Design a binder for this molecule. Structure first.
Ligand SMILES: *[C@@H]1O[C@H](CO)[C@@H](O)[C@H](O)[C@H]1NC(C)=O
Ligand SMILES: *[C@@H]1O[C@H](CO)[C@@H](O)[C@H](O)[C@H]1NC(C)=O
Ligand SMILES: *[C@@H]1O[C@H](CO)[C@@H](O)[C@H](O)[C@H]1NC(C)=O
Lengths: 36, 98
């Protein structure tokens, strides 16, 4: 059973920086001791 | 059933397969031979063919790594998937003979 939430707080976003985060692997190809 | 061959059903299997450095999952019917560990041979471990000398190696692989790589795009080490050992690969050709 789902309930429409009561006592909310008019949700608003803060803002900050991602810095050097979120880096992942662009491809499935294996690379070792590389610089691509 | 009695329609033109262009209107008759066709079954399509789109076998999308990827080969990575992960342990091999599906392999061909090729029969596994013995292992020669001091001679220049033609080797084919998991479809990765080559020509070289296989030797006992002390390099450490990741638990799911099947082959290593050199600075160039040449596999210098391969994990033999039967014994799970790590074999160094050396070129048959010796450069330097004058
Ligand atoms: C939550 O509010 C929406 C907006 O009227 C309404 O359509 C929906 O039925 C409500 N949810 C419940 C569980 O009553
Ligand atoms: C995040 O970036 C803003 C510029 O948009 C800067 O004013 C702020 O100091 C930065 N925060 C940190 C922790 O570096
Ligand atoms: C592979 O099969 C051979 C022959 O049955 C056996 O000697 C060897 O231990 C097996 N290796 C693995 C990892 O199952």
């Amino acid at each position: 059973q789902c309930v429409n939430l009561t006592g909310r707080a008019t949700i608003q976003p803060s803002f900050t920086n991602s810095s050097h985060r979120g880096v992942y692997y662009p491809d499935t190809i294996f690379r070792s001791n590389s610089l691509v | 059933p009695t329609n033109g061959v262009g209107y008759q059903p066709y079954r399509v299997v789109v076998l999308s397969f990827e080969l990575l450095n992960a342990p091999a999952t599906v392999c061909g019917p090729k029969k596994s031979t013995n292992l020669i560990k001091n001679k220049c041979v033609n080797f084919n471990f998991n479809g990765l063919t080559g020509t070289g000398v296989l030797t006992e190696s002390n390099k450490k692989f990741l638990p799911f790594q099947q082959f290593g790589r050199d600075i160039a795009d040449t596999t210098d080490a391969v994990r033999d998937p039967q014994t799970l050992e790590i074999l160094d690969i050396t070129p048959c050709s010796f450069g330097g003979v004058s």
